[PDB]
A and B are shown apart, each in its own frame.
Chain A
Protein backbone atom coordinates (compact mmCIF):
# COMPACT_ATOMS: atom_id res chain seq x y z
CA UNK A 1 0.00 0.00 0.00
CA UNK A 2 1.46 3.32 -1.18
CA UNK A 3 0.45 6.97 -1.62
CA UNK A 4 -2.61 8.84 -0.29
CA UNK A 5 -6.07 7.25 -0.50
CA UNK A 6 -9.10 6.77 1.69
CA UNK A 7 -8.15 3.58 3.58
CA UNK A 8 -9.60 0.58 1.66
CA UNK A 9 -12.38 -1.45 3.39
CA UNK A 10 -13.60 -3.71 0.48
CA UNK A 11 -15.52 -6.83 1.69
CA UNK A 12 -14.66 -9.62 -0.78
CA UNK A 13 -12.92 -12.03 1.59
CA UNK A 14 -15.67 -14.59 1.93
CA UNK A 15 -15.34 -17.43 -0.60
CA UNK A 16 -18.95 -18.63 -0.18
CA UNK A 17 -20.40 -15.29 -1.45
CA UNK A 18 -23.14 -15.45 -4.15
CA UNK A 19 -23.65 -13.13 -7.16
CA UNK A 20 -27.05 -12.13 -8.58
CA UNK A 21 -27.41 -10.95 -12.22
CA UNK A 22 -30.47 -9.32 -13.79
CA UNK A 23 -30.51 -10.60 -17.36
CA UNK A 24 -34.14 -11.67 -16.81
CA UNK A 25 -35.41 -8.09 -16.08
CA UNK A 26 -37.18 -7.37 -19.46
CA UNK A 27 -38.79 -10.83 -19.64
CA UNK A 28 -40.20 -10.87 -16.09
CA UNK A 29 -41.69 -7.42 -16.79
CA UNK A 30 -43.54 -8.88 -19.79
CA UNK A 31 -44.93 -11.77 -17.69
CA UNK A 32 -46.31 -9.39 -15.00
CA UNK A 33 -48.10 -7.42 -17.77
CA UNK A 34 -49.70 -10.58 -19.21
CA UNK A 35 -50.90 -11.82 -15.78
CA UNK A 36 -52.63 -8.49 -15.01
CA UNK A 37 -54.34 -8.52 -18.42
CA UNK A 38 -55.85 -11.99 -17.97
CA UNK A 39 -56.83 -11.26 -14.36
CA UNK A 40 -58.67 -8.17 -15.68
CA UNK A 41 -60.88 -10.32 -17.94
CA UNK A 42 -61.97 -12.68 -15.15
CA UNK A 43 -63.65 -9.73 -13.37
CA UNK A 44 -64.32 -7.55 -16.45
CA UNK A 45 -66.49 -4.57 -15.31
CA UNK A 46 -64.79 -4.24 -11.90
CA UNK A 47 -61.44 -2.47 -11.22
CA UNK A 48 -58.48 -4.76 -10.50
CA UNK A 49 -57.49 -2.70 -7.42
CA UNK A 50 -59.41 -1.88 -4.19
CA UNK A 51 -59.95 1.51 -2.50
CA UNK A 52 -57.48 2.45 0.26
CA UNK A 53 -57.36 5.19 2.99
CA UNK A 54 -55.13 8.27 3.26
CA UNK A 55 -52.78 8.38 6.25
CA UNK A 56 -49.98 10.65 7.45
CA UNK A 57 -46.32 9.57 7.23
CA UNK A 58 -44.22 8.71 10.21
CA UNK A 59 -41.33 10.79 11.48
CA UNK A 60 -40.57 14.50 11.95
CA UNK A 61 -38.97 14.32 8.46
CA UNK A 62 -42.24 13.30 6.70
CA UNK A 63 -45.08 14.77 8.88
CA UNK A 64 -46.15 17.15 6.12
CA UNK A 65 -46.86 14.46 3.52
CA UNK A 66 -49.84 12.12 3.02
CA UNK A 67 -49.73 8.57 1.66
CA UNK A 68 -51.95 5.52 0.99
CA UNK A 69 -52.53 3.07 3.88
CA UNK A 70 -53.76 -0.56 4.27
CA UNK A 71 -57.50 -0.38 5.10
CA UNK A 72 -60.47 1.58 6.49
CA UNK A 73 -61.39 1.21 10.19
CA UNK A 74 -64.76 -0.05 11.44
CA UNK A 75 -65.50 3.52 12.69
CA UNK A 76 -64.85 5.21 9.28
CA UNK A 77 -67.09 2.66 7.50
CA UNK A 78 -69.94 2.99 10.03
CA UNK A 79 -69.82 6.83 10.02
CA UNK A 80 -70.41 6.83 6.24
CA UNK A 81 -73.51 4.67 6.76
CA UNK A 82 -72.14 1.35 5.43
CA UNK A 83 -71.71 -2.09 7.03
CA UNK A 84 -68.49 -4.14 6.83
CA UNK A 85 -69.93 -6.96 4.71
CA UNK A 86 -71.29 -4.47 2.15
CA UNK A 87 -68.02 -2.53 1.94
CA UNK A 88 -66.15 -5.72 0.98
CA UNK A 89 -68.72 -6.50 -1.75
CA UNK A 90 -68.05 -3.06 -3.33
CA UNK A 91 -64.23 -3.27 -3.29
CA UNK A 92 -63.26 -1.28 -0.14
CA UNK A 93 -60.24 -2.55 1.87
CA UNK A 94 -60.58 -3.11 5.67
CA UNK A 95 -58.01 -2.96 8.53
CA UNK A 96 -59.20 -3.69 12.06
CA UNK A 97 -55.76 -3.09 13.67
CA UNK A 98 -55.72 0.68 12.98
CA UNK A 99 -56.98 3.21 15.59
CA UNK A 100 -58.36 6.77 15.25
CA UNK A 101 -56.83 9.47 17.47
CA UNK A 102 -57.62 12.75 15.62
CA UNK A 103 -60.72 14.59 14.44
CA UNK A 104 -59.05 15.66 11.14
CA UNK A 105 -57.83 12.20 10.07
CA UNK A 106 -61.32 10.75 10.55
CA UNK A 107 -63.14 13.54 8.65
CA UNK A 108 -60.92 13.14 5.54
CA UNK A 109 -61.33 9.37 5.28
CA UNK A 110 -65.13 9.74 5.57
Chain B
Protein backbone atom coordinates (compact mmCIF):
# COMPACT_ATOMS: atom_id res chain seq x y z
CA UNK B 1 0.00 0.00 0.00
CA UNK B 2 3.05 2.30 -0.26
CA UNK B 3 2.56 4.08 -3.57
CA UNK B 4 0.62 7.09 -4.82
CA UNK B 5 -2.17 5.62 -6.93
CA UNK B 6 -5.51 6.70 -8.39
CA UNK B 7 -8.02 5.35 -10.95
CA UNK B 8 -8.09 6.88 -14.46
CA UNK B 9 -11.90 6.39 -14.64
CA UNK B 10 -13.84 5.37 -17.76
CA UNK B 11 -13.39 6.77 -21.28
CA UNK B 12 -9.72 5.84 -21.82
CA UNK B 13 -10.27 2.24 -23.11
CA UNK B 14 -8.73 0.73 -19.93
CA UNK B 15 -9.89 -1.28 -16.87
CA UNK B 16 -10.67 0.84 -13.80
CA UNK B 17 -7.93 -0.49 -11.47
CA UNK B 18 -5.88 2.13 -9.49
CA UNK B 19 -2.64 3.07 -11.25
CA UNK B 20 0.75 4.47 -10.15
CA UNK B 21 1.37 8.24 -10.54
CA UNK B 22 4.89 8.68 -12.02
CA UNK B 23 7.02 9.85 -14.97
CA UNK B 24 10.41 8.96 -16.48
CA UNK B 25 10.17 5.22 -15.65
CA UNK B 26 8.39 2.14 -17.02
CA UNK B 27 6.44 2.05 -13.74
CA UNK B 28 4.11 4.87 -14.91
CA UNK B 29 0.54 3.67 -15.48
CA UNK B 30 0.92 0.18 -13.94
CA UNK B 31 -1.74 -1.28 -11.70
CA UNK B 32 -1.07 -0.54 -7.97
CA UNK B 33 -3.03 -1.69 -4.92
CA UNK B 34 -5.40 -4.65 -5.57
CA UNK B 35 -4.80 -8.33 -4.79
CA UNK B 36 -4.84 -9.19 -8.54
CA UNK B 37 -1.90 -6.80 -9.21
CA UNK B 38 1.87 -7.38 -9.31
CA UNK B 39 3.35 -5.77 -6.20
CA UNK B 40 -0.11 -5.12 -4.69
CA UNK B 41 -1.56 -6.07 -1.28
CA UNK B 42 -2.61 -9.69 -0.43
CA UNK B 43 -6.21 -10.67 0.36
CA UNK B 44 -6.93 -10.57 4.12
CA UNK B 45 -3.31 -9.94 5.31
CA UNK B 46 -2.09 -12.33 7.98
CA UNK B 47 -2.26 -10.75 11.38
CA UNK B 48 -0.89 -11.29 14.90
CA UNK B 49 -4.33 -11.34 16.60
CA UNK B 50 -5.02 -14.97 15.53
CA UNK B 51 -5.53 -17.48 18.36
CA UNK B 52 -2.32 -19.52 18.55
CA UNK B 53 -2.91 -21.77 21.61
CA UNK B 54 -5.79 -24.16 22.55
CA UNK B 55 -7.48 -25.16 25.83
CA UNK B 56 -8.06 -28.72 27.12
CA UNK B 57 -9.78 -29.60 30.42
CA UNK B 58 -7.42 -30.54 33.27
CA UNK B 59 -9.52 -33.66 33.92
CA UNK B 60 -8.94 -34.94 30.37
CA UNK B 61 -5.20 -34.14 30.54
CA UNK B 62 -4.90 -36.18 33.75
CA UNK B 63 -6.89 -39.12 32.32
CA UNK B 64 -4.98 -39.19 29.01
CA UNK B 65 -1.60 -39.32 30.78
CA UNK B 66 -2.81 -42.13 33.04
CA UNK B 67 -3.88 -44.33 30.13
CA UNK B 68 -0.73 -43.47 28.19
CA UNK B 69 1.37 -44.78 31.13
CA UNK B 70 -0.76 -47.97 31.13
CA UNK B 71 -0.05 -48.67 27.45
CA UNK B 72 3.72 -48.74 28.11
CA UNK B 73 3.28 -52.27 29.53
CA UNK B 74 1.21 -53.99 26.82
CA UNK B 75 3.51 -55.79 24.29
CA UNK B 76 1.04 -55.38 21.40
CA UNK B 77 1.16 -51.57 21.68
CA UNK B 78 4.93 -51.31 22.18
CA UNK B 79 5.61 -53.48 19.09
CA UNK B 80 2.92 -51.56 17.18
CA UNK B 81 4.78 -48.23 17.52
CA UNK B 82 7.79 -49.93 15.95
CA UNK B 83 10.01 -50.45 18.99
CA UNK B 84 11.72 -53.84 18.57
CA UNK B 85 11.76 -55.96 21.71
CA UNK B 86 12.54 -59.51 20.47
CA UNK B 87 15.57 -59.86 22.78
CA UNK B 88 14.14 -58.21 25.94
CA UNK B 89 13.29 -60.75 28.68
CA UNK B 90 10.27 -58.99 30.24
CA UNK B 91 8.33 -55.69 30.36
CA UNK B 92 8.48 -53.42 32.32
CA UNK B 93 12.20 -52.80 32.94
CA UNK B 94 13.22 -51.44 36.35
CA UNK B 95 16.84 -50.49 36.96
CA UNK B 96 18.08 -50.53 40.55
CA UNK B 97 19.56 -47.65 42.47
CA UNK B 98 23.23 -48.10 43.48
CA UNK B 99 24.18 -47.66 39.81
CA UNK B 100 27.54 -45.89 40.36
CA UNK B 101 28.21 -45.18 36.64
CA UNK B 102 29.83 -41.86 35.61
CA UNK B 103 31.23 -42.55 32.09
CA UNK B 104 29.43 -43.18 28.78
CA UNK B 105 31.80 -46.12 28.16
CA UNK B 106 30.37 -48.19 31.04
CA UNK B 107 26.85 -46.75 30.51
CA UNK B 108 26.39 -48.41 27.11
CA UNK B 109 27.56 -51.78 28.48
CA UNK B 110 24.65 -51.66 30.98
CA UNK B 111 22.07 -50.93 28.26
CA UNK B 112 23.39 -53.75 26.08
CA UNK B 113 22.94 -56.23 28.95
CA UNK B 114 19.21 -55.31 29.13
CA UNK B 115 18.83 -56.38 25.46
CA UNK B 116 18.50 -52.92 23.88
CA UNK B 117 21.24 -53.32 21.24
CA UNK B 118 18.98 -53.79 18.18
CA UNK B 119 16.75 -50.86 19.25
CA UNK B 120 19.72 -48.48 19.64
CA UNK B 121 21.27 -49.53 16.29
CA UNK B 122 17.89 -48.91 14.61
CA UNK B 123 18.15 -45.28 15.77
CA UNK B 124 21.81 -44.61 14.80
CA UNK B 125 21.35 -45.93 11.23
CA UNK B 126 18.27 -43.70 10.70
CA UNK B 127 19.76 -40.22 10.25
CA UNK B 128 18.65 -38.57 7.00
CA UNK B 129 18.15 -35.08 5.52
CA UNK B 130 14.48 -34.04 5.42
CA UNK B 131 12.54 -33.68 2.15
CA UNK B 132 11.20 -30.21 1.29
CA UNK B 133 11.73 -26.56 2.32
CA UNK B 134 12.01 -27.48 6.01
CA UNK B 135 15.68 -28.28 5.38
CA UNK B 136 16.26 -24.50 4.91
CA UNK B 137 14.43 -23.49 8.13
CA UNK B 138 16.61 -25.13 10.82
CA UNK B 139 14.90 -28.54 10.70
CA UNK B 140 17.54 -30.35 8.66
CA UNK B 141 17.93 -33.88 10.12
CA UNK B 142 15.30 -36.43 11.20
CA UNK B 143 15.78 -39.39 13.58
CA UNK B 144 13.57 -42.23 14.84
CA UNK B 145 12.36 -42.27 18.45
CA UNK B 146 13.97 -44.60 21.00
CA UNK B 147 13.81 -45.33 24.79
CA UNK B 148 12.71 -42.81 27.44
CA UNK B 149 14.43 -42.93 30.87
CA UNK B 150 12.43 -41.79 33.94
CA UNK B 151 14.15 -41.02 37.24
CA UNK B 152 12.59 -38.86 40.10
CA UNK B 153 15.87 -38.71 42.15
CA UNK B 154 19.08 -36.99 40.97
CA UNK B 155 21.77 -39.48 39.83
CA UNK B 156 24.99 -39.59 37.77
CA UNK B 157 23.46 -42.09 35.32
CA UNK B 158 21.51 -39.25 33.67
CA UNK B 159 24.62 -37.58 32.25
CA UNK B 160 26.22 -40.96 31.41
CA UNK B 161 23.49 -42.08 28.98
CA UNK B 162 22.40 -38.81 27.39
CA UNK B 163 24.84 -38.61 24.45
CA UNK B 164 23.62 -41.98 23.08
CA UNK B 165 21.35 -41.29 20.00
CA UNK B 166 17.62 -41.68 20.60
CA UNK B 167 17.78 -41.79 24.41
CA UNK B 168 15.45 -39.25 26.04
CA UNK B 169 14.94 -38.27 29.75
CA UNK B 170 12.13 -36.85 31.96
CA UNK B 171 11.06 -36.76 35.65
CA UNK B 172 8.06 -38.79 36.74
CA UNK B 173 6.34 -35.84 38.42
CA UNK B 174 6.15 -33.78 35.20
CA UNK B 175 5.83 -36.50 32.54
CA UNK B 176 4.31 -35.06 29.32
CA UNK B 177 1.96 -36.58 26.69
CA UNK B 178 4.27 -35.39 23.87
CA UNK B 179 6.93 -37.74 25.30
CA UNK B 180 4.50 -40.58 26.19
CA UNK B 181 2.57 -40.69 22.91
CA UNK B 182 4.75 -39.25 20.06
CA UNK B 183 2.71 -38.34 16.97
CA UNK B 184 -0.45 -39.27 18.92
CA UNK B 185 0.21 -43.06 18.91
CA UNK B 186 0.70 -44.73 22.29
CA UNK B 187 3.11 -47.27 23.76
CA UNK B 188 6.61 -45.81 24.08
CA UNK B 189 9.28 -48.05 25.61
CA UNK B 190 10.32 -46.85 29.10
CA UNK B 191 13.27 -47.58 31.41
CA UNK B 192 12.06 -46.99 34.99
CA UNK B 193 14.27 -46.17 37.97
CA UNK B 194 13.29 -48.10 41.14
CA UNK B 195 12.28 -44.96 43.08
CA UNK B 196 10.18 -43.68 40.15
CA UNK B 197 8.23 -46.94 39.78
CA UNK B 198 7.17 -46.87 43.46
CA UNK B 199 6.03 -43.26 43.10
CA UNK B 200 3.26 -44.12 40.61
CA UNK B 201 1.10 -45.23 43.57
CA UNK B 202 1.23 -41.78 45.20
CA UNK B 203 0.67 -40.00 41.86
CA UNK B 204 -2.31 -41.92 40.43
CA UNK B 205 -3.54 -43.58 43.63
CA UNK B 206 -5.63 -46.76 43.71
CA UNK B 207 -8.80 -47.81 41.88
CA UNK B 208 -11.94 -46.02 43.15
CA UNK B 209 -9.90 -43.81 45.51
CA UNK B 210 -8.72 -40.19 45.34
CA UNK B 211 -5.08 -39.33 44.59
CA UNK B 212 -3.39 -37.23 47.27
CA UNK B 213 -0.90 -35.78 44.76
CA UNK B 214 -3.54 -34.84 42.14
CA UNK B 215 -6.38 -33.12 44.06
CA UNK B 216 -9.91 -33.82 42.80
CA UNK B 217 -8.89 -36.78 40.59
CA UNK B 218 -9.93 -40.43 40.77
CA UNK B 219 -9.49 -43.39 38.46
Instruction: Give me the interface of A with B, judged by CB distance under 8 Å.
Output: 19, 21
Contacts and interface: CB of A to CB of B under 8 A. Distances in A.
Interface residues of B, number: 2
Interface of B: 48-49
A21 B50 CA distance: 10
A5 B157 CA distance: 64
Contacts of B48: 21
A21 B52 CA distance: 11
Contacts of A19: 49
A25 to B, nearest CB: 11
A21 B47 CA distance: 12
A19 B48 CA distance: 10
3 contacts: A19-B49, A21-B48, A21-B49
A21 B49 CA distance: 7
Nearest to B47: A19
A101 B49 CA distance: 53
Q: What are the 3 tightest A-B residue pairs by CB atom distance, in nearest-first order? A: A19-B49, A21-B48, A21-B49
Nearest to A19: B49
Nearest to B49: A19
Contacts of A21: 48-49
A19 B47 CA distance: 12
B45 to A, nearest CB: 15
B20 to A, nearest CB: 27
A17 to B, nearest CB: 12
B51 to A, nearest CB: 11
B53 to A, nearest CB: 10
A23 to B, nearest CB: 8
A21 B48 CA distance: 8
A39 B121 CA distance: 50
A67 to B, nearest CB: 24
A19 B49 CA distance: 8
B21 to A, nearest CB: 26
A42 to B, nearest CB: 29
B78 to A, nearest CB: 35
A62 to B, nearest CB: 26
